[PDB]
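Case study B.
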Amino acid sequence: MDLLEAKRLLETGRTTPLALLEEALERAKAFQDRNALAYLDEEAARKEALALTEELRRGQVRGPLHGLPLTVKDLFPVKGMPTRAGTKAPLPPLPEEARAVRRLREAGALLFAKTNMHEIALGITGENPWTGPVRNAVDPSRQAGGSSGGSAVAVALGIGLASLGTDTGGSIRIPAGFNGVVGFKPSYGRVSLEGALPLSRSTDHAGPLTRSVRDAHFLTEILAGESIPLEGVQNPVFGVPLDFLEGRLGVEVRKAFTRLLEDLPALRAEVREVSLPLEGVYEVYTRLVRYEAARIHEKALKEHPEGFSPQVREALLAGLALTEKDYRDAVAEREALRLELVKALRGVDALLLPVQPLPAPPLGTEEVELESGRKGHREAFITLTLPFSLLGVPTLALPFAKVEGMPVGLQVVGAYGEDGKVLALGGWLEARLG
Amino acid sequence: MDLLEAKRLLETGRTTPLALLEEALERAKAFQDRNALAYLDEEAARKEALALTEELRRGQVRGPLHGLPLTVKDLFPVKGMPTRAGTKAPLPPLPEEARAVRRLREAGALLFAKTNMHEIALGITGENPWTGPVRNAVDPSRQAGGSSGGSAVAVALGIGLASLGTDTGGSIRIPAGFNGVVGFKPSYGRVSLEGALPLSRSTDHAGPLTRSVRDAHFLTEILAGESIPLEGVQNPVFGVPLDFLEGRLGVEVRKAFTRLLEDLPALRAEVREVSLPLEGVYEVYTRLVRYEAARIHEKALKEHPEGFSPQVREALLAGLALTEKDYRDAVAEREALRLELVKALRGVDALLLPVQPLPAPPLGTEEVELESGRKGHREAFITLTLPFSLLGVPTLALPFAKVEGMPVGLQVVGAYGEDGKVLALGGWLEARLG
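Model:
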């Protein structure tokens, strides 16, 4: 079941906050081999669940999420819970509770655990030598992906009804696709990242991982502290950046995506090719993010570099090697790319493209096979998502197909501020997809 | 007369390039004391004028601007002319001709002079101790304003039919307002700034100064190298950011603006209040721009600081005092404001607000009187324009009122990439204003 479904059961008295927690805890124990949780205090959780249950009986409701069990990516401070960000290195000062978390707590949600994540959110594999890897919800021998891997798996397996994560280069969308769940990255700044561990301040996005589009819409309003109206959808027009996708997809995802485009007309939708070159976007993003990330962890990298894994340590050092000039160039280059996206979105309701070039790869996979040849993991899996987080436009990731039994996600991209439209379009597609 | 009317006279054989030039040169001589020109070579100009005249007589049209006299702000390199940028300090290496200038030249335009500008474009007063102040076209005792001051005054006085300038925080719109001409700042990057002296690469904009909105559109298409469709206007809906304007207008401009709002309904238009807080936007803009500007002139500031005026030197030094950390924060703060502007524009065709809080003030005026009390000149006159250049959205400035017998301009703000819509709405308003 999902959030709104469980909410209705609570309102009709068919279930209780305590019961919902027990089911979540039961799933957490049965799927420990997935290693999705970074921190879990069953005792404190049960105590809180008891209070929420008794409150529901006395007629006291904290908010719209009252009694609903949720998890939080371990980069958001949560009261009574430690924050480790998947690393052994010290972290910069952070408050007791992130603003976004406060929104959930004040709404009555029951935050019962922190989810694992790729070390300091700098990576998308989900493999972590410090905490152990997070394993794919569908196949325990494949990657859960990242860096909100634990959150995605938790939601997929029923460990909590939803989860809160972050997306800088696709860290919400990628794991959502890998594990067959919904991941929404709102327009930049929509949801507050105050109090949370930063990676790339001008590119980080806070967002939900859910089992349905309606839950993503519902949760985003609470997280943003504002209503996001949903409009009706009829004869939607979808733009497809074929030039951008050329040679960036795997053979199987290519077939599934092509099939989707072929079936849309029958579903009464329209498919139009659009142009989205975005030349150099990969390195623009990489330099901008690594430069900022390295500065965030500069002190720890100097005093306690051994606290970082080899991959992260190398990435941070590479960021430190980038000069302020390199940063200024990247900043200017990002601004230059905006018009290109505006034009591509002009005339269509949203852009559609896979969120991944292949299904979740086996654990340890460093190179993958694309339709245009072998490519490095990072470049193959981050290129499809980074442009939209870099430019800050609302982007939803939802399941649209399967490859050899593994989930493959689809991206729905809208213009800046069109969060409601993207979610509306997402629900329309979700209903007509598998 | 304007560009398109002169172009009509040329096609009908009622005038020649040589005659159009002589007219421009007579005006330059007559109003020479306004000090609008930084460089003028009459002989070289006349020589080119002769060539264009003969070519036209034998049906050899170079382009849409063939034989039309135009001026260029002195930060854009022009063949056969020196580039001084209103300063005595050494400048970074620049090519012989700026890309935007090449667009004009290849169109057949007769570029006969460089216009003066606030030193290195870092300022909006138009006062320059090196070249002497550029004086307002209407009243030489008042500021021409800046930093495309000479360009606006030249256009206002008929010294050339149009001009090319830049706008980073309002450098095109402010002088246009002050002198009663049209100034258009297209979406960021639409007009190439390649080969031109930069101030803030991620915030600079190239744009035209004209006598009419139709000229602004005409020239922008040529400068951008692409056609910009002009859709009809019917029942336009204008958004007014009252909260943003609260206390930032002078009593008289407030009255003129209110009058316009009162008349729009009778003109078959709608006026809706919108919210645009943009708290701290002034500081964000200032730090971001000064940081980038200081790095451009870093070498000269160290080697020949005396080449910069005190005012400019102080701003540049403030830019060097800001660290890369301050820049990263400024970069993040800018992105945080983007959603606010997007939301204010949703549901309306454009935003309307004065381009200035008061008519051009006397030279040397450091403090002014706003409806909320005294305020420093810079903050009073840059705060109204900087948000739109900071965020890169198309913004038009056109005359709409008179105060103290001085011109007062109006800003028409559109969504990113909607230059055509802005220009169309500008034409609609122009035909219904004064």
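The first helix of chain B runs from residue 3 to 11. The remaining cases will be described in the next quarterly update.
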